Write a protein that binds this ligand. Structure first.
Ligand SMILES: [Mg+2]
Ligand SMILES: [Mg+2]
Ligand SMILES: [Mg+2]
Ligand SMILES: [Mg+2]
Ligand SMILES: [Mg+2]
Ligand SMILES: [Mg+2]
Ligand SMILES: [Mg+2]
Ligand SMILES: [Mg+2]
Ligand SMILES: [Mg+2]
Ligand SMILES: [Mg+2]
Ligand SMILES: [Mg+2]
Ligand SMILES: [Mg+2]
Ligand SMILES: [Mg+2]
Ligand SMILES: [Mg+2]
Ligand SMILES: [Mg+2]
Lengths: 137, 170, 39, 244, 347
RNA sequence: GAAACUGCGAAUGGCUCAUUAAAUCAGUUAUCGUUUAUUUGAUAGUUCCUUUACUACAUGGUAUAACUGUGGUAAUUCUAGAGCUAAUACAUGCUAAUCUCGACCCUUUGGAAGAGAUGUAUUUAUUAGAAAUGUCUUCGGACUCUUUGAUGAUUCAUAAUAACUUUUCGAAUCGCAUGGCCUUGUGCUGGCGAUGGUUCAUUCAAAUUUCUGCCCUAUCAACUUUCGAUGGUAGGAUAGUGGCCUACCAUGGUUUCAACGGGUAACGGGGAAUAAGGGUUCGAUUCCGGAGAGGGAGCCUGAGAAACGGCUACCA
């Protein structure tokens, strides 16, 4: 977890060594709302992610989308593919189209290429990432 | 000359973007303030709106908090020891947030004897490492403020896992 | 120059501050009484 | 633009003011105030194009500078002051008291009221929060911040405000069967009783309203204004009683 | 002297072991100047946040100083207060000195001592002439003004009242920090006469609600064996007054708990003198009579336990040998039934 | 009431369509991601705290314009030296309170011996923010307990503890008028307004931002990444999110569902013409939104500008 120059910690969560009441490091978490069950892996996990929707300083608000994971080769985020049909009126016919959306995935989720993920909008995480995985299936 | 605009950057696809418009004031940036240890020099900066930002060009004293004891004292900042982002800042003793720095231990020590009457005992017990630094006379602290914005260098004394990790890195 | 009008203005300002404080205290007491009624 | 705008084209002005398109090139831009720009009636339009007491802008200015016009019990001298919904306009010289309520057509109507009714107004509770020093307060649709409110008051309820003191005399909860006035959308101006409140988390809530004539319609919660219990409104209603 | 650079210089110039700190040889010449400088800053009226911080900074540098210099700083505070005449005579206040100016002066002195005690705590250097001697005089003035002054001068009566409140608090502070280290045999008689004695009559009537500084003073004497001579003065008036608080109908649970804890300490700390035997009999017999009513008033389980800790104490030293002690102990116990192992052992 | 200082405005209005091909723009979202002059509504008694050796019946030039007078230049909405004088300019700085309990009397319209408590603003750390089914009573009532709010959702609203600050604010301002108490003092008190001021909310707004939608071209098939391209973390900067930039890391991101590159006599839309319907073409042009002020670049002021009927350089 401390695989870096800088120490990873949940901000403003203080662990008083003197009291030493419990072995486990105190961990702060929240529920994201809209009936999205926070997985237990987040509650009893040890990872630290400022962009996680359940333990980080990020809120899910706005559109909620669903897609299929197309790429998962990059650190803590994936690329999903949303497919749809665009309507051409002149020919009165449909046309298959698609768009790639990069989405941040918290380590609390284990996502493979091919599974269906429901993602919620959040504040701009990176240059292209504006969504956060909130449910996997 | 400094701008934060995203239009000059390439698109996600790899396409580049033609100049949509001239640079705007509401998307500006200002020169970094490499705060360094020394006699206090701070000058104000008029920012967007009527607000003001304080720029710390030099500073030598700052308020540091002992969280375990729940106290805060004003102490002299001696020198920068380790900075995670970049090490030439450590070389130049540049002060910024998250920089690990060394502070003199006299005020905390004096408060320790005053409160607990010891250079009761169970409460007076502290970490072995923290006592070792007291014996040294110098304490490792992490700066929690942003000197380039607020003009302060507040921080907190390292403890427990923080202190152990940074000692391993040192 | 020191003139009676300046003294009158100063006295009025002080009286206004006192009256505002008194009115705020009365409002706070009324709200506390209402909560006591509800509980 | 490099700053806030200060002009308004007549074609760009709100439709419901009913401004002649050929009279001129510009329309009165409402100044900042209790009500939003698009949901407000500036005093110049009300005094000139509705009551016809003034024939031109200069006459309206002369009327206002005489301090003959009171808005919610306070004298206003701004020609473009944004009077709005449930606003009380008093003209003592004419012995006239008006309440701004939209008609079935969807326009502000010249509705005369008695002094007793003019002594108060109704405000939709837009927000309830604790201020500094832990003092609770409510913010209404007209920008009034009222401290020490009743705890039972919540968002979307309606508070009866006494103009003289600016305090809460009574309140009406948002609940099924309550009498409701529509202040937005195509159903603007209609009156009906609540039937059901559809709640969608993270989205706009929808309210079903049923008129006296048995017709039903669905409107967003933001356009809803509770005005009393069915058959017993707390304010005199305009002609037609918000039907059709 | 410069206000903008005042606080930074205190850390750099005055901090112990500092690189820019005054050399040990030069301390004697420079420090007297430094004390006068800081004394001037300590007189700033704390009306704003910045001004409060400046006052805190001035008092916070004292631990850096060596104790003789710290004692010098306190002497400067007490120099203006004229106290030699009061203890020079048989502890009588001059009418001329009784003025709002003097009351304002002692108020400033007491506040500085309170701040110094908070920062130094156990390391606070206590001396008769520098600190304690003026301290007792100030509380004497507060009593003298309060009784003698007429109701018309409401402001003067208020200023005297605050001085007594701060003065008593300033006392109870110094007892708790340096009471044991300092030997009070010399000043014990004056302190009782000038502070404790005048208020002894009503002490029960005054402190029913919450513990007061004067009550905290008596408790501190009850706990420490060396200071029992205070409790011996004037036929155990101070001790007798403690139980009159207990004997009162309207004593609350906040005041009740500490006193029985203090009574237990007196009961559990033997002292070799005739007065101690008389005291414990007065402590014990007085406590036993009122205890059943006391139990009803308690609302805390811990407050229940401390009575049992007192009851079990009385059995250990054999006071239960007396029939009256045994009977009243039994009457108190049946109320408790009307910890369990402690009760059983007592039975 | 000329002139001048101060305050505000001059960032609106008007004109044009050069650049711009997921850009602008249309519809639709978000700010739990941030600034907001102004309008509107609320909002600030901190009593005390030693040199009281004391201005608040009110402090300075730490100061100048207009003005007087002596001058330079061919010339400009150019200005130098000397002498003056004001503030809602500039810089300083103060003046016997309220609230908890309340013994004791007294039993209420009660008195109060006494024990206690005391603004804001910035920075950091920490903390809070979740079988009383009885008894009596006058039949009423009393006896013990409760004790934050909101969102779908938060480290939210709010409060508390310890310190911190070249650190702010907490009225040294103005018009009209002369009422009320008396111990008769140029004593005490007092009306209606104007202008300012901290914080919150509202309003006019601004900046980013979610999803979908653009003409021709495949005889443009691979593109982006050395000089940031994709993401991680930490810092800097920003009003703020963010590779926006910096340091170290991984090797990523788009594409035959047409990426990338090329053309466009390409500002987009509401709309206009034609057509029986499908369609095809036009839209600089009365409204909305974007950009520009000969071409690039950078800036002071201010809430708001990369301003051009504002400023500085370079090119012509
Ligand atoms: Mg919402
Ligand atoms: Mg192109
Ligand atoms: Mg787009
Ligand atoms: Mg204005
Ligand atoms: Mg001159
Ligand atoms: Mg960052
Ligand atoms: Mg780099
Ligand atoms: Mg073109
Ligand atoms: Mg066009
Ligand atoms: Mg236009
Ligand atoms: Mg422009
Ligand atoms: Mg030209
Ligand atoms: Mg320009
Ligand atoms: Mg021009
Ligand atoms: Mg222009």
């Amino acid at each position: 977890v401390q695989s870096e120059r800088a120490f990873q910690k949940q901000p403003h969560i203080f662990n008083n060594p003197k009291v030493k009441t419990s072995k486990r490091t105190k961990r702060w978490y929240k529920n994201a709302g809209l009936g999205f069950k926070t997985p237990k892996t987040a509650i009893e996990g040890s990872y630290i992610d400022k962009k996680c929707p359940f333990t980080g300083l990020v809120s899910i608000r706005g559109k909620i989308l669903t897609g299929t994971v197309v790429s998962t080769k990059m650190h803590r985020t994936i690329v999903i593919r949303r497919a749809y049909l665009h309507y051409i009126p002149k020919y009165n016919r449909y046309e298959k189209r698609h768009k790639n959306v990069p989405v941040h995935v918290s380590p609390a989720f284990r996502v493979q290429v091919g599974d269906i993920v429901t993602v919620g909008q959040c504040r701009p995480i990176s240059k292209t990432v504006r969504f956060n995985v909130v449910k996997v299936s | 000359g400094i701008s934060r605009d995203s239009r000059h950057k390439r698109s996600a696809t790899g396409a580049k973007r033609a100049q949509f418009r001239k640079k705007r004031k509401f998307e500006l940036g200002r020169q970094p303030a490499n705060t360094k240890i020394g006699a206090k020099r701070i000058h104000s900066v008029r920012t967007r709106g009527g607000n003001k930002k304080y720029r710390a060009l030099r500073i030598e004293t700052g308020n540091f908090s002992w969280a375990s004891e729940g106290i805060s004292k004003k102490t002299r900042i001696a020198g920068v020891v380790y900075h995670p982002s970049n090490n030439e800042l450590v070389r130049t003793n540049t002060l910024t947030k998250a920089a690990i720095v060394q502070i003199d231990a006299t005020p905390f020590r004096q408060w320790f004897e005053a409160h607990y009457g010891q250079t009761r005992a169970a409460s007076a017990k502290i970490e072995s490492s923290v006592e070792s630094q007291f014996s040294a006379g110098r304490l490792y602290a992490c700066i929690s403020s942003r000197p380039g914005q607020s003009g302060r260098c507040d921080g907190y004394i390292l403890e427990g896992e923080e202190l152990a990790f940074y000692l391993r890195r040192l | 120059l020191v003139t009676p009008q300046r003294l009158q203005r100063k006295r009025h300002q002080r009286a206004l501050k006192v009256r505002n404080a008194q009115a705020q205290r009365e409002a706070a007491a009324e709200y506390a009484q209402l909560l006591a009624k509800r509980l | 633009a490099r700053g806030p705008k200060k002009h308004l084209k007549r074609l760009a002005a709100p439709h419901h003011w009913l401004l002649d398109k050929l009279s001129g090139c510009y329309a009165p831009r409402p100044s900042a105030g209790p009500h939003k720009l698009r949901e407000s009636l500036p005093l110049i339009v009300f005094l000139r194009n509705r009551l016809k007491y003034a024939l031109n802008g200069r006459e309206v200015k002369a009327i206002l500078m005489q301090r003959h016009v009171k808005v919610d019990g306070k004298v206003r001298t701004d020609t473009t002051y944004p009077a709005g919904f449930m606003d009380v306009i008093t003209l003592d010289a004419t012995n006239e008291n008006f309440r701004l309520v939209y008609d079935v057509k969807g326009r502000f109507a010249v509705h005369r009221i008695t002094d007793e009714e003019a002594s108060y107004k109704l405000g939709k509770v837009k927000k309830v929060q604790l201020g500094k020093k832990g003092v609770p307060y409510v913010v209404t649709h007209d920008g009034r911040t009222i401290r020490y409110p009743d705890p039972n008051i919540k968002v979307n309820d309606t508070v009866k405000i006494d103009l003289a003191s600016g305090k809460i005399t009574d309140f009406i909860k948002f609940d099924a069967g309550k009498l409701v006035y529509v202040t937005g959308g195509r159903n603007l101006g209609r009156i009906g009783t609540i039937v059901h409140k559809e709640r969608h988390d993270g989205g706009f809530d929808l309210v079903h309203i049923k008129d006296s004539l048995d017709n039903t319609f669905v409107t967003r919660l933001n356009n809803v204004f509770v005005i009393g219990e069915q058959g017993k409104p707390y304010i005199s209603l305009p002609k037609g009683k918000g039907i059709k | 002297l410069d206000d903008t650079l005042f606080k930074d210089e205190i850390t750099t110039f005055l901090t112990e072991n500092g690189s820019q700190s005054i050399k040990a040889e030069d301390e004697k010449v420079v420090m007297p100047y430094v004390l006068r400088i800081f004394f001037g800053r300590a007189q700033v009226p704390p009306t704003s946040g910045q001004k409060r911080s400046r006052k805190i900074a001035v008092i916070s540098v004292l631990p850096n100083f060596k104790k003789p210099y710290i004692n010098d700083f306190l002497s400067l505070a007490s120099e203006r207060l004229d106290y030699n005449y009061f203890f020079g005579n048989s502890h009588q206040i001059n009418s001329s000195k009784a003025t709002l100016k003097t009351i304002r002066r002692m108020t400033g002195f007491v506040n500085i001592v309170n701040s110094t005690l908070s920062v130094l705590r156990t390391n606070f250097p206590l001396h008769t002439n520098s600190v304690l001697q003026p301290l007792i005089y100030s509380i004497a003035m507060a009593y003298y003004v309060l009784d003698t002054e007429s109701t018309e001068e409401v402001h003067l009566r208020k200023m005297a009242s605050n001085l007594r409140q701060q003065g008593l608090k300033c006392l109870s502070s110094v007892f708790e920090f340096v009471g044991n280290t300092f030997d009070w045999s010399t000043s014990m008689e004056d302190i009782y006469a000038v502070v404790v004695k005048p208020r002894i009559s009503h002490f029960s009537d005054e402190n029913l609600q919450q513990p007061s500084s004067l009550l905290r003073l008596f408790l501190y004497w009850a706990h420490n064996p060396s200071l029992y001579q205070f409790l011996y003065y004037d036929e155990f008036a101070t001790a007798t007054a403690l139980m009159d608080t207990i004997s009162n109908q309207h004593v609350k649970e906040a005041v009740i708990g500490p006193i029985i804890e203090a009574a237990d300490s007196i009961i559990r700390n033997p002292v070799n003198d005739d007065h101690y035997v008389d005291l414990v009999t007065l402590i014990c017999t007085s406590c036993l009579k009122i205890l059943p009513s006391l139990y009803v008033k308690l609302s805390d389980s811990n407050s229940i336990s401390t009575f049992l800790n007192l009851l079990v104490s009385i059995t250990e030293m054999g006071f239960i040998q007396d029939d009256h002690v045994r009977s009243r102990l039994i009457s108190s116990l049946i109320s408790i039934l009307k910890d369990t192992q402690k009760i059983l052992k007592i039975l």
